[PDB]
Amino acid sequence: MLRFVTKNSQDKSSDLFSICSDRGTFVAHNRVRTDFKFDNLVFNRVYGVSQKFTLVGNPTVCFNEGSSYLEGIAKKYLTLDGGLAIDNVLNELRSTCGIPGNAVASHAYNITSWRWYDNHVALLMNMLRAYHLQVLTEQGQYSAGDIPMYHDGHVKIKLPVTIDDTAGPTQFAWPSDRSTDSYPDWAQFSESFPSIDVPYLDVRPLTVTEVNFVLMMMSKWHRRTNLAIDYEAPQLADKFAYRHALTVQDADEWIEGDRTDDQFRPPSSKVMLSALRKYVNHNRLYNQFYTAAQLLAQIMMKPVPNCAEGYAWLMHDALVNIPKFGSIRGRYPFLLSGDAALIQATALEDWSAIMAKPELVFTYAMQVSVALNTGLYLRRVKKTGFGTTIDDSYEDGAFLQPETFVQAALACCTGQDAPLNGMSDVYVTYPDLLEFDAVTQVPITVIEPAGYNIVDDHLVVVGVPVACSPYMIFPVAAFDTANPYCGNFVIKAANKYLRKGAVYDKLEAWKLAWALRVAGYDTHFKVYGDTHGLTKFYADNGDTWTHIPEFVTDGDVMEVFVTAIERRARHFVELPRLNSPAFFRSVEVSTTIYDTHVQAGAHAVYHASRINLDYVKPVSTGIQVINAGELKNYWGSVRRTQQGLGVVGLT
Amino acid sequence: MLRFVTKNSQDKSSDLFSICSDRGTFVAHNRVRTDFKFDNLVFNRVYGVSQKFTLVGNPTVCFNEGSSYLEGIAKKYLTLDGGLAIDNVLNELRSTCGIPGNAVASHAYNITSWRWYDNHVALLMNMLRAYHLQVLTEQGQYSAGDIPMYHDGHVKIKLPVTIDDTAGPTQFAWPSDRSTDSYPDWAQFSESFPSIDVPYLDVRPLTVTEVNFVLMMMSKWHRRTNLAIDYEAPQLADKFAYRHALTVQDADEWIEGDRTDDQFRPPSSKVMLSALRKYVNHNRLYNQFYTAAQLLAQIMMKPVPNCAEGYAWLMHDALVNIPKFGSIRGRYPFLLSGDAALIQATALEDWSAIMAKPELVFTYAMQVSVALNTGLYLRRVKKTGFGTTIDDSYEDGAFLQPETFVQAALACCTGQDAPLNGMSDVYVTYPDLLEFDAVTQVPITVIEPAGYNIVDDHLVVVGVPVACSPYMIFPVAAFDTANPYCGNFVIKAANKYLRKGAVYDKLEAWKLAWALRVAGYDTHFKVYGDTHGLTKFYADNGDTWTHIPEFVTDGDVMEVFVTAIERRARHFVELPRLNSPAFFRSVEVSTTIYDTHVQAGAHAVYHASRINLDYVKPVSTGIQVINAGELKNYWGSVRRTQQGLGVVGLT
Amino acid sequence: MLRFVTKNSQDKSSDLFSICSDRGTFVAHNRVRTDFKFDNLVFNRVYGVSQKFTLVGNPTVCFNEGSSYLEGIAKKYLTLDGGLAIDNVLNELRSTCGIPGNAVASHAYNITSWRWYDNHVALLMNMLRAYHLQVLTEQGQYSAGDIPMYHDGHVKIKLPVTIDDTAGPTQFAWPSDRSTDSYPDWAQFSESFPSIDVPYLDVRPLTVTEVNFVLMMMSKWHRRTNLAIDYEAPQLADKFAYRHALTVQDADEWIEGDRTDDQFRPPSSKVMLSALRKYVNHNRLYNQFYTAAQLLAQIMMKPVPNCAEGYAWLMHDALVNIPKFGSIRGRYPFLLSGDAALIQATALEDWSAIMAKPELVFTYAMQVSVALNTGLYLRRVKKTGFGTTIDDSYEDGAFLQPETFVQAALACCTGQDAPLNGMSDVYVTYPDLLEFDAVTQVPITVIEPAGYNIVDDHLVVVGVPVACSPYMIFPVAAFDTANPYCGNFVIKAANKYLRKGAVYDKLEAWKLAWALRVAGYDTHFKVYGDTHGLTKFYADNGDTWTHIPEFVTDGDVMEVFVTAIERRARHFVELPRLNSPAFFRSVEVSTTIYDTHVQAGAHAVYHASRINLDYVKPVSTGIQVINAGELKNYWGSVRRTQQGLGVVGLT
C-alpha cells in the first residue's frame, strides 16, 4: 500500500494530504507544463488542472464469517502455522501462574468444542472510519454529504441522495443510537483463563476513555450521513468480555440513561487514533489492521466526472465483504506476550507509516479511486487490442476473483503492482459492472439535441466511464507506447495522406488530438462506422484532458480519419496542420507536473504533506517479521506481465 | 548563504553592515569615479550614488507541517542509509527506567515513539527576528514602518500603511499581549520516560532569562509594526514540556498581575542571540537554523524604488510558508549525546559565520532584495531576449516552484549559484508574478502626463520594475555583454547617421544614454510606435541610473532613435557630439568605487565591519559533517547555464 | 577521580589532607624554590607560598527524576543490560522460598505498572556531607561559616552572607527540624516480596544506630550554616520501607517528642562513615556512590582570591542537578545476593580508596576548585589564540553540555583527563558564566583612585577571575609551551630591541615578568591599546604569582612593550635587564615544590597524609567488574587533544 503510493511519484518525494470535504466533495489542482518540439524549436505552456472527488457513496457492506488469524500472538503459544498451541497454554497455566492441576484439567475439558475465531477487521474498520468522521467534525467539515450537479449547456444532472445535507447533523455523534436499539453484553475480565466461548478483547494498556470508544465502536453503527465510509453496520458482538486493569462505567451510564449526551461525547481524533494505535500495537493485529485500512480506503471516495456519461460511475455502489468480529487475544493474560508471530513485513511497513501519517490512507484511497475507474475503463479499450501488444481477455480474467478484482483494475492501468488485502473472502467489488455490455441509466434534464442517448429523461451508458484525470498519478501510462498518460510522446507521420485530411491508427489519432487540443486546436474526425456520439475530439476545461474516443472501444475499426483541424478560441502554441504532407513535422510533447495541491470548498487550501521514509522505519523488536506469505490468504500484489496480469507473491 | 554574499571567497575579505532604519528605511551610499577614455585621454568624475531600502512589508505567512529533520541527534541512532534506528533508541530506555523486560518499547511507542515530527524553524525564526527588532530598540530606532513617497516633478506616489508611525511604539515589547490572548501550556519535565505525545525541547544549559525568552518566543506573536520581519504569528505549540534542571516561572508571573510589565521587559539582543546560539548548539539544529535564517533574510527588507515606474513591485507581499513547530530533542537526554549526525557543511559555515557576525544576515538579505528584484526583471528579457530568440529555449521553468523561485531570480541576474532553502515545502515567494509577463497597477496622483500611460490614477506595468541600483553587488554580471551592471563598457557609434544622426541598437542607446546622463547630458530619443509619451531617457538623482525602457524590451523595436543629446542643468566632464558623425570617437567607460557605507535616518554613519573567512572556520570536532546531500530536502543551488538555468545539487 | 588526584603529583607520592576550617576558611602553604641559570650560573630562591580557600557557599541544588540504575544487583536477576529480570525474580519466589503459585501469580499481577526507579545518589550525598559536618564538629571547627574580607590599601570588600557565624551553632545537629516539619513514613520490612511501589531500602547488615542515621538523612535537610556542602534539601521520600532484621524505634521516639534532644544526638563520624560504607557495600551502589562523592566534591569549596577582581568568583553560585531518591534493593531479600553486576572498575577503585581515606574527597575537591577556576579563566585567554597551537571555540564547545561542563574546565587547564560523573542529567555548573562577556557586580569600599572599575560602590568584572594559585597542582601547565604554570621555562630574546625597552609576544612578556618579579624586580609595560587597568605586571605576596595580564585576554593585540624594569624593595637574584640587546642572556628558571601543607586558623597545622596504592586495592570477590562503559551514562573522562578537548571512553 505505502510502497505503492510512493511508486506513483516515481519515488520522487510523495506529497500526500489528509481528509477534507465541502458537503461531500473536494478538488485537486496541479500546475502542469507541456512542451512542443520540432526542428529544435521548443514551446512550453503552463496551465491549471483540477479534478474533484466525492466522499459520498452508499456501499453495500456484507458481513460473513471469515478465517481465524492468530498471526500476532506469541510464538510460544502457536504452532509452526496459524494453529493455536493449546497444550502449551494449558501447561503455562499450571506452571507459571497459580492454578491447580484439577482446575486446569477441568477447564481443558470445557474448552473442548470451542471455536477459536479471531477477526478484528470489522472493529478496526469502525475505529478507523469513525476517526475520519471525527477529523471532519473537528475541522468543521462534517455534514450530511451531497453530490455535485453536472450542468454543461446541453443538459443538467443532479444525482439523488437519500439524506438532506442541509437539515442534517454538523457533529459526528456516536453511531449507536440511544434508546432505539439494544446493546452488546460487555464485561471486564481479569481472570487467568476463559470461562466462555464469547469474544475476549484485550485493552489492558488502553486508557479508560479510549476503552469506552472501543466499546462504542463494538456496538451498533448507524449510517447518519451519505459518505461512503459511513456505511451502516450491526453490533460486532452480541456479548463479550474485555481484559483491562479495571471495570469501566463511563459508557455504561450513557446507555443506562443517567449520563448526559453531553457528558459522554465522541473523543477527539487524537485519542481515537491513540486507542487504535494502542490496540493494534498491543494485540499485534498489524496484519489484520492492514486488511481493514486497505478495504476502507478502497471505498473511501469516488472521483467526480466532467461529463454526463462519466456520471454512471457514481451511479453504482461497491459490494464489500467484511468478516464477522472475533476475539481471543483477551482470553489469556499471556497471549500477547513474548514475541509477535507471523507478522508481515509489508503490514508493519505500512502500519507504522499510517500511524505517523494517517493522511496516507486518505491519499492512498484517492489514488486508488482514480486508478480504479481508469483501469476499469482501460479494460474495455485494452481488450480492443488498443495499444496492447499483449493479447488477453481482460473481460473475464482477473475481475472474476473478488479479492483480486479491484487490484486487477489498478495494475491494468498503473502498470505497477496492486497490493492485495492479505486475507480471504474479503473485498470491494462492482459485480454488476463485470459485464462489458453492462448498461447504466442516468437521470438527465435534457436541454439540448447535441445528442447523447435518450429515453424517458435518462441517458444510456455502457461499461466504465472515464471520469477522473490521470494527474493524481501523472506518471501512469495505461499503455506500452508513448501517449498522453505517458511522460511524453511524439506525433508521427499519418501513415496515409490525401486531399481532405489524413488517416491514422486508433492510437496515433488520439495521441495527436490530445496534444493538439492542449495546443489550442480542435480536432475533427470521421470514421467508417457510426456510434460516435459526435465529430470532434472531446476534451474539457479544468484538466484539459482529451478523453480517449469512445468509438475506438468498439473493435474492427482500426483506423480513424482526422479532418479539419482549426485553432480554438484560446490559442497557445502555434503548430503545423500535421495532417498535411507538407506542413508536417515530427513533434515531441512532454508534460510534467510542477506543483500539486488540494482545496475543499472555497477557502480551504491544503499544502502537500511530506513523509521521510528513513524516519518512518518499523520496529522489529519483539516481532517475528516474515517476508514470505502464501497466496491463499492473498499476500502479495498482482501485476501486468508480458504474459498478462496475474497474481504474484510479495517477496 | 555565506558563500553567496562574499563571492565564494574572492580576494577573500568582506565588509558588511547591520540593521538600522529611519522609520523603516535606510540608504546604501556609494562613492564612485566613472572614466571617459577617448582621444587617448581619460576624463572622469566622482559622485554620490545612494539607494534607499525599506524594511517595511506585510508578508502573508502561513504555517503547516514540513518533513521532520532529525539531523540534530546522535550518530548512534541516525544513519545516512540506515536512516532512523528506532529499535536502537527503545533498546536504551530498557536499562534506564522502571520498565520490566519487553513491556518497555511497546509502552514507549504507543505514546510518543511513533511521531518524531521534529522541526525548530518557527521558533528559531522568532528568536532571530525578535533579536533584529530588539537591536533597533537598543540603537534607538524601533519605530513603525513607513513607505517613503515618490515625487518626480511629475506624478507622486504614496502607499497605505495599516498602522501609523509617529503615534506608534518606540520600544520592541513582547509579541504576546497579556490580558488579551491565551498561552501555551508548558512545564519542566525530567522523567526518563515521557508520558505524553507532545513537543519536548531541550534548554537545560540555558540560563533562566534565556529560557524565559524561549517560552516568550514560543508564545503567540503579535505584529505591532509594518516591518516585514514582524510577521504576525500564533503560538508554535498549544502545549509542551522543556528539559531543564530548574522550573522557570518569571514568565508565568508576568502572565498575571503578579509580575509587573516593567520588571520583565525583553532581554538585550546580546542575551537573545547568546540564548539562541546555545539552543541551536545544544540540540544541534545547525541545518534547521540555516534555513530559518534564510527565509527571514529573503523577506527582510525591500529596495526603495528610485523610479515611479518601479513602485509597483513594492506593494507585492511575498507569500511565505514556514513549517509547523515540532520538537524531538527534549524527549530524552541520551538523544543529544555524541557526534551530531548528518550536518551540512554549508549550514555549519553559515552558523559559524552568522553567530560570530550576525550582521551578515542583514547585509545578505539586502543583496537578495535587489538581486531578486533585478533577476525578476531580467527573466522578462532573458526569455525573450529583446525579441531575438523565437522559441522558449531559455528554460526558466524553475521559476514555477515556490522554493526555487527566489533563488532563480538571483541566479538570473548574477552568475552566482543561488543558495537553496535547505528544507522542503518551505519558502518565500510572490505567486502573483509566476508569469513573467505579469501586469500590475499603481495608485497615482497627477502632475503633467508624459510617457506615463496611466489609467484613471492607475499606472500599468509589466513583469517587474527596476526599483534600484547595482553597486552593493556591483561587479554584477547580468548581461553576457559589457554594460553598466558589468562595471565597464564602450561606445561604438550609430549604425547609420541621419539628419540628427540618431541610430542605435536598443541597448546601445541605453548604454550611451546611461553614460551621457552621468557626464551631464540627458539624451532624447524617438520611436514611431507607442512611446506612450516617452521622448527621453529617465534618471533619478539619488540613484543616477538610466533604465532600459519597457519599449527596449517590448520586442517590437530593435533600432533606436537618439534625436539629440542636451546639456543638463548640472554639467560634469565634457564631451563631443557623438550622436553625429565627424565628432564621434568611441569612449571606454569604467566606473570604480572609492568608498561604500550605509547610513539610516540621518545622524552618525556606519562603516562596514569586514568579515574574513578562516576565523569563522567551524570546528568539526564531535560532529558528523556532510558535504553532499540529496535534492529532495532541497540542498544545492539554482544555477545559470547556456540554455537558461536549472536546479543543481551541492554535490 | 583517584587516578586524577594522583596524576597531579606526577604520581610521585600524593600528599592529601582532611577537612578543616576556621569560620569557613583555610590556607595551604608550599616551600618552593626557583632557579635562575645563565652562562652556567645558578641562583636558587626559596620562599613561602600560600593560598586560602572557603567551604562557604550557597549552591542552588535542584532535584529532578533521573534514570534507574540497577547496576549493583545480582547478575541472576538482571538482563544483559540494566533491565530487571522480573521473570527470574518471580520464579525465585516460588522455587527457592515458600510461596504458593497463586500467591506469586497475584503479586505479579499487582506488580504490573510499577516503575522500578533506583537512585540513591541523593541520600548518599547527605550521609557523606553530614559526615564532613560531623567531622568538623568533632574537631571543634563547626561554625556558621563566613567569607574573608579583602582589603589591600586602595579598597576593602566583605562579601555579605545571610547567617552570622558568631551567634550560630557550634554543634552539628540533625538537619531535620524538630516540630517544624513533617516526616517520611518509614517502616521495617521483612517480607519475601514488595506490597507497595514505595521505595525499599536495604540495611539488614547495618547497626541499629547506623540505621537511625540513614532514616535521619532520609528525612528533611535544613541548611543551618553557610558552608556549600550544607545545602538545604527536602525529605528524599514521603514514605518508604526498610529491610532489616528488626524494627527500629530510637529515632521514632525523638520525633514523637518522648526522646530527649540529648538522648538522641548525631553519631560520630566513624559510625557515620561505617553506616555509609556498610550501606554502599551491601547494596553495591559503588557506581552510584561514585557519582555522589563526585558531585559533592565539585561544590565542596572555592579558593579565595588576593585581588578585588577575583572576588567575582565567590559572587556566583553553582547550579547542581541531583536525581530524586529511589530504592528497590530492599524490595527483595535476595536482590543484593549472588554476584554484583555492572560495577565499574573506576568506581570500585575510587570507592575503596575513599573508604580507607575519606580525606581523598576533600583533597580532590580542593584540587578541582582551583583547577576549575583556572581552567575557566584560561578559557578566555586560550580562545585568544594565546599559547594555543590548537584553534577552537572554547567559548561554546564543551561548556554547553551540563555533565561535561565542569570537566572541560579542568582538562582545559590541567591538560589531563577530567573524570565524568558516571550518570546522566547530574552535574554542577555555572550557567550565568558560560558567557565570555558575562559581567559581575562586586560591592567594594573605595579607598583609592588607583583605578579599577567603579559604579555605585561596586566594581565591574568580566568572565572568570584568576583567584587561586597553581601551587595546589604545581605540575599543571595551561599551555603547550614552557611557562610559569610549567615546571620550567627559558626567557628568550625579545624579538625586537630599541631605546626605551623591548617588544615581546603576549606570552614571552608574561613568561619574563613572572620570573622577573619572583627575582625581585617590577616589570612595567605599555601596549598599543587601553583597557589595562594599569601599567606594571601585578603579582601579590603570599604566593608571589605574577598573574597573566588581563589586556592579553583581548585579542588582536599580539605584542606587548615592556619598559623600565626596576628592582623591587626586597631583592633576591640579581639579573640582566634582559630587555637590553647587550645585557641580555638566555635564562632558564625552574620552580619546584619541596614541601606542602595546610593550616586552618592560627593553631591548626595539618601534615600531608600518604596513601599506599598497593594496599588500597579493591575487592573483586562477588563483583562483576566491567572496564568498559558507554558515554550516554557518561562513563569516561574528557581530555584536551590535538584536535581539541572532547569526551572519550574510560577504557
Side-chain angles (χ1 to χ4, degrees), chain C residues 222-237:
Chain C
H222 279 290
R223 172 174 262 272
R224 239 70 95 164
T225 60
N226 284 321
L227 296 311
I229 62 168
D230 193 85
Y231 66 84
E232 170 149 327
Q235 76 186 44
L236 296 307

PDB file of all heavy atoms in Angstrom, chain C residues 222-237:
ATOM      1  N   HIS C 222      17.806  20.708  56.592  1.00  0.00           N
ATOM      2  CA  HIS C 222      17.749  22.157  56.730  1.00  0.00           C
ATOM      3  C   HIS C 222      19.135  22.797  56.776  1.00  0.00           C
ATOM      4  O   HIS C 222      19.987  22.412  57.578  1.00  0.00           O
ATOM      5  CB  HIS C 222      16.965  22.535  57.989  1.00  0.00           C
ATOM      6  CG  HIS C 222      15.480  22.493  57.804  1.00  0.00           C
ATOM      7  ND1 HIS C 222      14.801  23.402  57.021  1.00  0.00           N
ATOM      8  CD2 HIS C 222      14.544  21.646  58.295  1.00  0.00           C
ATOM      9  CE1 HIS C 222      13.511  23.116  57.036  1.00  0.00           C
ATOM     10  NE2 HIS C 222      13.328  22.056  57.802  1.00  0.00           N
ATOM     11  N   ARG C 223      19.343  23.778  55.904  1.00  0.00           N
ATOM     12  CA  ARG C 223      20.611  24.496  55.813  1.00  0.00           C
ATOM     13  C   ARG C 223      20.782  25.437  57.003  1.00  0.00           C
ATOM     14  O   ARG C 223      20.283  26.561  56.993  1.00  0.00           O
ATOM     15  CB  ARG C 223      20.648  25.292  54.506  1.00  0.00           C
ATOM     16  CG  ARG C 223      21.831  26.228  54.359  1.00  0.00           C
ATOM     17  CD  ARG C 223      21.854  26.848  52.971  1.00  0.00           C
ATOM     18  NE  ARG C 223      22.776  26.150  52.081  1.00  0.00           N
ATOM     19  CZ  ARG C 223      24.067  26.443  51.969  1.00  0.00           C
ATOM     20  NH1 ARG C 223      24.590  27.423  52.693  1.00  0.00           N
ATOM     21  NH2 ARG C 223      24.835  25.754  51.135  1.00  0.00           N
ATOM     22  N   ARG C 224      21.495  24.971  58.024  1.00  0.00           N
ATOM     23  CA  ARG C 224      21.717  25.768  59.226  1.00  0.00           C
ATOM     24  C   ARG C 224      22.950  26.671  59.155  1.00  0.00           C
ATOM     25  O   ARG C 224      23.023  27.677  59.859  1.00  0.00           O
ATOM     26  CB  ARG C 224      21.819  24.851  60.449  1.00  0.00           C
ATOM     27  CG  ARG C 224      20.775  25.126  61.527  1.00  0.00           C
ATOM     28  CD  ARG C 224      19.378  24.714  61.078  1.00  0.00           C
ATOM     29  NE  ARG C 224      19.030  23.365  61.520  1.00  0.00           N
ATOM     30  CZ  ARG C 224      17.793  22.880  61.539  1.00  0.00           C
ATOM     31  NH1 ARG C 224      16.776  23.631  61.142  1.00  0.00           N
ATOM     32  NH2 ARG C 224      17.571  21.640  61.955  1.00  0.00           N
ATOM     33  N   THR C 225      23.916  26.317  58.309  1.00  0.00           N
ATOM     34  CA  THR C 225      25.128  27.124  58.175  1.00  0.00           C
ATOM     35  C   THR C 225      25.324  27.660  56.758  1.00  0.00           C
ATOM     36  O   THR C 225      24.458  27.494  55.899  1.00  0.00           O
ATOM     37  CB  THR C 225      26.384  26.327  58.588  1.00  0.00           C
ATOM     38  OG1 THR C 225      26.522  25.176  57.749  1.00  0.00           O
ATOM     39  CG2 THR C 225      26.274  25.887  60.040  1.00  0.00           C
ATOM     40  N   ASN C 226      26.469  28.296  56.520  1.00  0.00           N
ATOM     41  CA  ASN C 226      26.766  28.882  55.218  1.00  0.00           C
ATOM     42  C   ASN C 226      27.655  28.042  54.303  1.00  0.00           C
ATOM     43  O   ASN C 226      27.870  28.401  53.147  1.00  0.00           O
ATOM     44  CB  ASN C 226      27.412  30.257  55.406  1.00  0.00           C
ATOM     45  CG  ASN C 226      26.407  31.325  55.783  1.00  0.00           C
ATOM     46  OD1 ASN C 226      25.289  31.352  55.266  1.00  0.00           O
ATOM     47  ND2 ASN C 226      26.799  32.215  56.688  1.00  0.00           N
ATOM     48  N   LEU C 227      28.170  26.929  54.814  1.00  0.00           N
ATOM     49  CA  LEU C 227      29.034  26.066  54.017  1.00  0.00           C
ATOM     50  C   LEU C 227      28.299  25.551  52.781  1.00  0.00           C
ATOM     51  O   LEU C 227      27.108  25.250  52.836  1.00  0.00           O
ATOM     52  CB  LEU C 227      29.536  24.895  54.866  1.00  0.00           C
ATOM     53  CG  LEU C 227      30.440  25.260  56.051  1.00  0.00           C
ATOM     54  CD1 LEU C 227      31.549  26.197  55.594  1.00  0.00           C
ATOM     55  CD2 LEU C 227      29.611  25.914  57.146  1.00  0.00           C
ATOM     56  N   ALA C 228      29.021  25.452  51.668  1.00  0.00           N
ATOM     57  CA  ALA C 228      28.450  24.995  50.405  1.00  0.00           C
ATOM     58  C   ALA C 228      27.833  23.599  50.473  1.00  0.00           C
ATOM     59  O   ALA C 228      26.761  23.364  49.915  1.00  0.00           O
ATOM     60  CB  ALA C 228      29.512  25.041  49.312  1.00  0.00           C
ATOM     61  N   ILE C 229      28.510  22.676  51.146  1.00  0.00           N
ATOM     62  CA  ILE C 229      28.009  21.310  51.264  1.00  0.00           C
ATOM     63  C   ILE C 229      26.880  21.214  52.288  1.00  0.00           C
ATOM     64  O   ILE C 229      26.416  20.121  52.616  1.00  0.00           O
ATOM     65  CB  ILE C 229      29.139  20.332  51.664  1.00  0.00           C
ATOM     66  CG1 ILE C 229      29.713  20.714  53.030  1.00  0.00           C
ATOM     67  CG2 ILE C 229      30.234  20.351  50.608  1.00  0.00           C
ATOM     68  CD1 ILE C 229      30.617  19.654  53.631  1.00  0.00           C
ATOM     69  N   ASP C 230      26.439  22.368  52.780  1.00  0.00           N
ATOM     70  CA  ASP C 230      25.366  22.437  53.768  1.00  0.00           C
ATOM     71  C   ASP C 230      24.033  22.802  53.115  1.00  0.00           C
ATOM     72  O   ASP C 230      23.089  23.200  53.798  1.00  0.00           O
ATOM     73  CB  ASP C 230      25.717  23.474  54.840  1.00  0.00           C
ATOM     74  CG  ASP C 230      24.824  23.379  56.062  1.00  0.00           C
ATOM     75  OD1 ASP C 230      25.125  22.562  56.957  1.00  0.00           O
ATOM     76  OD2 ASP C 230      23.825  24.124  56.132  1.00  0.00           O
ATOM     77  N   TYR C 231      23.964  22.661  51.795  1.00  0.00           N
ATOM     78  CA  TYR C 231      22.753  22.975  51.040  1.00  0.00           C
ATOM     79  C   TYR C 231      21.495  22.360  51.653  1.00  0.00           C
ATOM     80  O   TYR C 231      21.533  21.251  52.181  1.00  0.00           O
ATOM     81  CB  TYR C 231      22.901  22.502  49.587  1.00  0.00           C
ATOM     82  CG  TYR C 231      22.986  20.998  49.408  1.00  0.00           C
ATOM     83  CD1 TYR C 231      21.831  20.217  49.337  1.00  0.00           C
ATOM     84  CD2 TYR C 231      24.220  20.357  49.289  1.00  0.00           C
ATOM     85  CE1 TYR C 231      21.902  18.836  49.149  1.00  0.00           C
ATOM     86  CE2 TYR C 231      24.301  18.975  49.102  1.00  0.00           C
ATOM     87  CZ  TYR C 231      23.138  18.224  49.033  1.00  0.00           C
ATOM     88  OH  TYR C 231      23.212  16.861  48.852  1.00  0.00           O
ATOM     89  N   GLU C 232      20.385  23.090  51.571  1.00  0.00           N
ATOM     90  CA  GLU C 232      19.112  22.623  52.113  1.00  0.00           C
ATOM     91  C   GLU C 232      18.396  21.706  51.126  1.00  0.00           C
ATOM     92  O   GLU C 232      18.289  22.017  49.938  1.00  0.00           O
ATOM     93  CB  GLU C 232      18.200  23.808  52.453  1.00  0.00           C
ATOM     94  CG  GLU C 232      16.768  23.401  52.789  1.00  0.00           C
ATOM     95  CD  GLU C 232      16.102  24.337  53.780  1.00  0.00           C
ATOM     96  OE1 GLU C 232      16.804  24.884  54.657  1.00  0.00           O
ATOM     97  OE2 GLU C 232      14.870  24.524  53.682  1.00  0.00           O
ATOM     98  N   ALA C 233      17.902  20.581  51.627  1.00  0.00           N
ATOM     99  CA  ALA C 233      17.202  19.611  50.794  1.00  0.00           C
ATOM    100  C   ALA C 233      15.940  19.095  51.481  1.00  0.00           C
ATOM    101  O   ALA C 233      15.837  19.112  52.707  1.00  0.00           O
ATOM    102  CB  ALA C 233      18.130  18.450  50.462  1.00  0.00           C
ATOM    103  N   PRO C 234      14.961  18.623  50.690  1.00  0.00           N
ATOM    104  CA  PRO C 234      13.699  18.093  51.219  1.00  0.00           C
ATOM    105  C   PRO C 234      13.858  16.650  51.687  1.00  0.00           C
ATOM    106  O   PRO C 234      14.963  16.110  51.669  1.00  0.00           O
ATOM    107  CB  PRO C 234      12.728  18.209  50.037  1.00  0.00           C
ATOM    108  CG  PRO C 234      13.560  18.656  48.845  1.00  0.00           C
ATOM    109  CD  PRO C 234      15.003  18.558  49.221  1.00  0.00           C
ATOM    110  N   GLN C 235      12.760  16.028  52.111  1.00  0.00           N
ATOM    111  CA  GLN C 235      12.829  14.643  52.562  1.00  0.00           C
ATOM    112  C   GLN C 235      12.748  13.704  51.362  1.00  0.00           C
ATOM    113  O   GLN C 235      11.707  13.558  50.724  1.00  0.00           O
ATOM    114  CB  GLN C 235      11.721  14.347  53.587  1.00  0.00           C
ATOM    115  CG  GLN C 235      10.316  14.169  53.034  1.00  0.00           C
ATOM    116  CD  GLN C 235       9.285  14.017  54.138  1.00  0.00           C
ATOM    117  OE1 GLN C 235       9.310  14.747  55.132  1.00  0.00           O
ATOM    118  NE2 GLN C 235       8.373  13.065  53.976  1.00  0.00           N
ATOM    119  N   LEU C 236      13.889  13.088  51.064  1.00  0.00           N
ATOM    120  CA  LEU C 236      14.050  12.165  49.944  1.00  0.00           C
ATOM    121  C   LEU C 236      12.801  11.396  49.525  1.00  0.00           C
ATOM    122  O   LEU C 236      12.453  11.366  48.344  1.00  0.00           O
ATOM    123  CB  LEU C 236      15.177  11.179  50.258  1.00  0.00           C
ATOM    124  CG  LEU C 236      16.588  11.764  50.407  1.00  0.00           C
ATOM    125  CD1 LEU C 236      16.932  12.587  49.177  1.00  0.00           C
ATOM    126  CD2 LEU C 236      16.673  12.616  51.666  1.00  0.00           C
ATOM    127  N   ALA C 237      12.131  10.768  50.485  1.00  0.00           N
ATOM    128  CA  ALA C 237      10.927  10.003  50.186  1.00  0.00           C
ATOM    129  C   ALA C 237       9.823  10.326  51.181  1.00  0.00           C
ATOM    130  O   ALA C 237      10.057  10.360  52.388  1.00  0.00           O
ATOM    131  CB  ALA C 237      11.236   8.511  50.213  1.00  0.00           C
TER     132      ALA C 237
END
